Structures are given as C-alpha cells and as structure tokens.
C-alpha cells in the first residue's frame, strides 16, 4: 500500500473470496464448508442406513426400526481403541462397506467436525475484521470448542478406547450421561457444579434482561403493537436505564447501572461455566474423579446407624455399575450370576 | 394532619422512597421468608437425624453430625406422615417433631407462600413506577418449577418423603430416584427444558458478545471500556446497525433481528416458555405419566429381540429401581 | 536515570470489591468441603 506494488494471482483470488454475497465464503470457507457439510451429511447417512450390530451389538438405524430418539452414529469397538480408522488404513483397507461396519463412520464425523469448528471460529474472525469490529463473538465460541475437544477427543484419548466416547445420537448421549454417574460420580465434581451455575446462571440473564428491556420501553408509537415503534438508526435508546435500575434496586437490592458492563456480564457467565467444566472432564480422562469423601466412608464402615444422602448415592452408583456394565462393555466378556449384583428386597 | 392512623400506615407501605420496597405482598412475604430462612439455617446445622422412610433408620443432615456442605441437607418428612398437615403443635414433644421430619414441612409451606408473593411485589412495584407489568410473568417460570418439586410431586405420590430435600447431595438423590421411576430423559418436556437452557445460554453468550463488540470509542486504552457509559445518558452506547450487519453476514441476512425490540422479546420468550414445559413435565410425571418406553421394541423375524440404546438405558434404570429405599419394599412392585 | 513515562495507575471501585470478595468466599464454600475430605 501507498507505494504501488503490483497484483499477483493470490491478490486476485482474495477479492472473489471476500466479495459480499448472500453467503460469505472468505478464506475460512475452504476449511468450513467441505468439513461442515460432510459432518452432518455423514451423520444423516449413519443414523439412517448404517448399523451398529457388529460394534456394540445393537441396532441403531431407521432401516432397523430405531426412531429419531434411538438412532445413533455409534462409536467403534474397543478392539481398535485409538486408530483413526482411515478408509484406506489397515483396519479398513479400502473396502467401504466393511469400513462402516467396524464403526469407522464415527471417526469420519468426529474428525470432520473438529476441523469444521476450527473453520467456523475462523469465519467469525475475518468477518469481524472486514466490518472492523471487536472479536468478542469469536472469543465466546471457544467455550463450545473446549467442550467439544475435551469430551469427544481428550476423554477417549485418556480412557481405554474410542468405544467410551459419546455416540452421535440422542439416546446414545443418554447412556454417556448415565455412564458418568455410576462409574465416575460426576455430579460431585465441583467443576461440573460450576458448569451448572454457568448454564443456569446464563439462562437467568437471558430471561431478565429480555424482560427488563421489554417492560421499561419508551412510548414512541401510538399503536399498542410496540414493535412497530423502532427506527433502528435512531440516536436515542429504546428503554429507560434509570427506571430499570430503580426497579431491581428495590425489588432485589442491587442492580446494574452500566449498559456496557451488563452485556459483557452476559458474555462472561456462560463462557466461564463451560470452561470450568472442560477442566472436570480432563480429570475424568485420567480417572482423577471426586468419587469419595474419606471421612464419611470410614464412619459408615464401622457403624450401620450413620447414613446421609451421600451414602445413599454410593449405593445407587453401585446399582448402575453392577447392572448395566454387562451389556455396556461387551468386550469385557463378563457374565453375572443373579446373586452377585446388589439389590434391596422384593 | 387530618389523616387517620391507617392512612399514615398505607402511605408508608406503598411508599416508594423506602430502601427496599414493601408493598402489600411484602407485608406477608417478608414475615414468611424470614421465618423460612431462620429455620432453614438451624436445621441445616443442628437438626437431629430424621426417619425419612418410616423404617426407623434416621438419616443425618446436620453439619454438627459429621457432614460437610455438600452432604448437608434438610431431610424430608417421614413416610408414615404422608400428606397429613404436621405443624409443630400436633407433636407431643418438640423432639418428636424433629425425629419425624419436622422442619421440612415448615420450610416448604412458608417458602412456597413466600415465592408466590415475591412474584406479587414484582408486579406491584412495576405499577408504582409506571412500568409495563410483565416481569412478574417471567418470574413464574421458576415458580412453576419450584412448586412442582416441592408440592405438586408429593401430591401425586402421596407423601412429602418423595419431594426434593433441601441439600446439594439431597438434590442428587432426587434426580436419580426420579429417573429410575419415571425416565425423565425420555420425556419431551424434559427435552424442551434442556433446550430451554442450552438455547438460553447461547442466546445470552451471543447477544452479550455483539453488544460488547460494537462499543463506540470514547475512552483511552489504559482505562476500562466500561467508562464510556455514563449513567442515565440518552444517546446509544453501541452501533446497532453494525451488529445486525455483522450477524447478517455470518449466517444469512434473514436469520437476524434488525428490530431490537423484537430481539429482546425473543430473549425473554425462549427460556421462559422452555422452563414452563419442564415445569409441567414432572407435574404430569407426578400423576404417573412417565415418558417414553421402547424396551423390547426392535424385534426381527423368528421372535427375537435386538438391543437398542433404549435397552441400555433400561439397564441403568433397572439397576436403580432395585436399589432406592433399600429396606422398604416388601412387595414386587413400586406402587408408592 | 530518566523517569519512566509508562507509569499507570490501578483502581478497583466498590462494586468490583464486592464481586471480588463474593467470588472468593463462594468457591471457598465450594472447595473446602473437598480439602478436608
């Protein structure tokens, strides 16, 4: 710039890529669009036609009678356990119809989803620099990436297989959730207790700020349809920050006074919640879980009169482990007599 | 003046000059919450252990009885009491009240009456300032949720023991026993509520990012960006056309709100409608309408049964059905 | 030698003191249950 350098083929290509259009391509579109399209298209193919009868030993497709809730692109078996399951690789060796049968279509979706999520976050950078804004939308989307990378990639790369990853289906998540209660006691990891407060806390800021604005509006029209009275290029604001302060100051006790700090606080609460829950899954990947309190397992060991809901939860975790792990981990080839599993009575 | 004693009193309750507004809901909210707060603290610290199930095995819930913050709870009312109104005076001695599950039913009755009326004074102050009144509607979404876990669910089951305890580990047992009996994860109302908060957090992270990312330059770089806003100003603190212009490029132009009054309605309406279904979820599950059940559903020819993931979730539920209330069930069905 | 022209000042207003002290005590309520086991 400002010295008259010449134009190369790369410079010519950039104008077509960063041309305004109905859908923005950019440079990140080369990473995003062929990696995002094959991810969900590889999900809809697997949930519809592709079985899971050889990997887990259970039907998972619409072509087998599973509905929308019970269809899943299932994880590979624990034989492979860390292979990338390339369609050319030694576990598949070119044959496509035997590649899907070993559960290798899971890794086609998880790996093409990861390079989608890199590309989509890069999409938010070059659009922001084009319109000359600040990058905070890109910085918030890192928290969905930290949840994706830790749960779907770091956790199987710490456990014994890709088998124990979540499968890309509705009810298949529902065992992965129930896997973590019995086998990990994941509800007592405070990193999940700070994840919940991020989720439920951000749901509360979405409901108050959306209702405080909507009830402190300025009368600018005369029809009672108050959405009609907003010219979006107007210089004045549309609601009363003074009145909204005094409402929650007397209802609740402390309220906001700063419209800049408020929307940033709505940024900080969900992002900190997921980032403080991606740390907890890292400990589970090494099985550094917060399973026990030592000083109450000792006291419940020597005395059959003492209990809490905590000791009532340890029995329920035993009920999940000693019951579902016969079918959940079929590679362990284990069978159970009906006397070795714990029960109550009748 | 010539004003009565009563008019002097009513021009103090409805006075907005007070530091915390009282109003006429607050004259019966404030003595109910201070009742329920001050008894919650004592039973969280010094309650003797409660027979929760009627089988005379008392469950500890106090910090003074070897619990920490997480395992502390206020233990629900015993199974033998059921739905009988059990105040403090029907018990002969005070310790007979504590052993039978006393302070659970004292808290919940004053708590639920308190939060019905905290919703009331959110209306009442909004009438005293000229605001539009619908913040009290949006607070009914947690009030619908808290009425269900304390009152609507013990009615359908018939006892306050199956309600939710007032403890962190006490909650976690209530989540487990519920899904073992009712399979909440396979109910579309719990699916709406789960989307109510995953959508609700997304709509707060996304909205709050774009307002921060369109702030107008008014300060230096050593000073924080929050100093550009001065309180009670008239002019707008961020470019709105730039954020619709950004988000219009991001997915497509029709996928955005240019009307900011239509935007903030959508942020209010999405979680509030979503929590209403998951409040009505376990309200209908209180009257034993559990959820979906696809056990032994995928079958082939020759009469054999193929597993699905729904049969795996069965094995989790079947492992928790035969473990909750471990010394209660004398009979092979869990009708209670 | 010369005085540094990069001398800046740090400030923490009262509404930020309250987010600080309430942050520290709350997760100290959280994690202290686990430190004593």
């Amino acid at each position: 710039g400002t010295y008259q350098e010449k134009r190369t083929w790369f410079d010519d290509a950039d104008d077509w890529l960063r041309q305004d259009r109905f859908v923005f391509v950019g440079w990140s579109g080369l990473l995003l669009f062929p990696c995002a399209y094959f991810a969900l298209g590889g999900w809809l193919t697997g949930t519809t036609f592709v079985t899971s009868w050889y990997t887990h030993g259970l039907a998972t497709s619409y072509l087998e009678g599973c509905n929308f809730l019970t269809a899943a692109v299932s994880t590979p078996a624990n034989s492979m356990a860390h292979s990338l399951l390339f369609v050319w690789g030694p576990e598949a060796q070119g044959d496509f119809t035997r590649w899907c049968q070993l559960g290798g279509l899971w890794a086609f979706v998880a790996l093409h989803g990861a390079f989608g999520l890199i590309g989509f976050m890069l999409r938010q950078f070059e659009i922001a620099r084009s319109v000359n804004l600040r990058p905070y939308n890109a910085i918030a989307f890192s928290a969905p990436i930290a949840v994706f990378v830790s749960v779907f990639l770091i956790y199987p790369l710490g456990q014994s297989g890709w088998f124990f990853a979540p499968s890309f289906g509705v009810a298949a998540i529902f065992r992965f959730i129930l896997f973590f209660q019995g086998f990990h006691n994941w509800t007592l990891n405070p990193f999940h207790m700070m994840g919940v407060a991020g989720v439920l806390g951000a749901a509360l800021l979405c409901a108050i700020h959306g209702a405080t604005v909507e009830n402190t509006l300025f009368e600018d029209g005369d029809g009672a349809n108050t959405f009609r009275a907003f010219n979006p290029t107007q210089a004045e604001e549309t609601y009363s920050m003074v009145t909204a302060n005094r409402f929650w100051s007397q209802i609740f006790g402390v309220a906001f006074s700063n419209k800049r700090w408020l929307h940033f606080f709505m940024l900080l609460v969900p992002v900190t919640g997921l980032w403080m829950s991606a740390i907890g899954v890292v400990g589970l990947a090494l099985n550094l879980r917060a399973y026990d309190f030592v000083s109450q397992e000792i006291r419940a060991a020597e005395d059959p009169e003492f209990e809490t809901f905590y000791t009532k939860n340890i029995l329920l975790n035993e009920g999940i482990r000693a019951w579902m792990a016969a079918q959940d981990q079929p590679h362990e080839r284990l069978v159970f007599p009906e006397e070795v599993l714990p029960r109550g009575n009748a | 003046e010539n004003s009565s004693l009563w008019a002097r009193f009513c021009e103090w309750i409805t006075s907005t000059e007070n530091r915390l507004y009282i109003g006429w809901f607050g004259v019966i909210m404030i003595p109910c919450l201070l009742t329920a707060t001050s008894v919650f603290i004592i039973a969280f610290i010094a309650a003797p252990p409660v027979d929760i199930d009627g089988i005379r095995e008392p469950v500890s819930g106090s910090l003074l009885y070897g619990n920490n913050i997480i395992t502390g709870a206020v233990i629900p009312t015993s199974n033998a009491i059921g739905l009988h109104f059990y105040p403090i005076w029907e018990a002969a001695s005070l310790d007979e009240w504590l052993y039978n599950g006393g302070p659970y039913q004292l808290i919940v009755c004053h708590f639920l009456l308190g939060v019905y009326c905290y919703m009331g004074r959110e209306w009442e102050l909004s009438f005293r300032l000229g605001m539009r009144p619908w913040i009290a509607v949006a607070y009914s979404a947690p009030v619908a949720a808290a009425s269900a876990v304390f009152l609507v669910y013990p009615i359908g089951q018939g006892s306050f023991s199956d309600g939710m305890p007032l403890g962190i580990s006490g909650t976690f047992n209530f989540m487990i026993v519920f899904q073992a009996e009712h399979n909440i994860l396979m109910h579309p109302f719990h699916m709406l509520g789960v989307a109510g908060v995953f959508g609700g957090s997304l709509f707060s992270a996304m909205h709050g990012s774009l307002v921060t990312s369109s702030l107008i330059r008014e300060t230096t770089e050593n000073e924080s960006a929050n100093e550009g806003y001065r309180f009670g100003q008239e002019e707008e603190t961020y470019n709105i056309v730039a954020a619709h212009g950004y988000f219009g490029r991001l997915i497509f132009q029709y996928a955005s709100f240019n009307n900011s009054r239509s935007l903030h309605f959508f942020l209010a309406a999405w979680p509030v409608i979503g929590i209403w279904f998951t409040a009505l979820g376990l309200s209908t599950m209180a009257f034993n309408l559990n959820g979906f059940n696809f056990n032994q559903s995928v079958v082939d020819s020759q009469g054999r049964v193929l597993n699905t993931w729904a049969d795996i979730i069965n094995r989790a539920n079947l492992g928790m059905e035969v473990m909750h209330e471990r010394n209660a069930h004398n009979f092979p069905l869990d009708l209670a | 030698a010369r005085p540094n022209p990069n001398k800046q000042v740090v400030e923490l207003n009262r509404t930020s003191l309250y987010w600080g002290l309430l942050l520290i005590f709350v997760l100290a309520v959280l994690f202290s249950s686990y430190i004593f086991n």
Binding site: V242, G253 | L63, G66, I69, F231, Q233 | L22, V29
Partner: peptide, 30 residues
C-alpha cells in the same frame, strides 16, 4: 472442628450480601 469452619464461611458470604445492599456505591445520575 470443621463444623465451625463451615459455618464461618457460610455466614461470611451472608456478610457481604448485607454490605452489598445497604453499603453499596450509590449510583449517581448524569
């Protein structure tokens, strides 16, 4: 011993909540 350490940190949090309401930094208009 820890049963009194817990109750310090509970009422400690309730301390700030008293001071954050009544002794807050008063917001000044304009």
């Amino acid at each position: 011993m820890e049963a009194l350490v817990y109750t310090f940190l509970l009422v400690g949090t309730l301390g700030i909540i008293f001071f954050s309401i009544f002794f807050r930094d008063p917001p000044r208009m304009i």
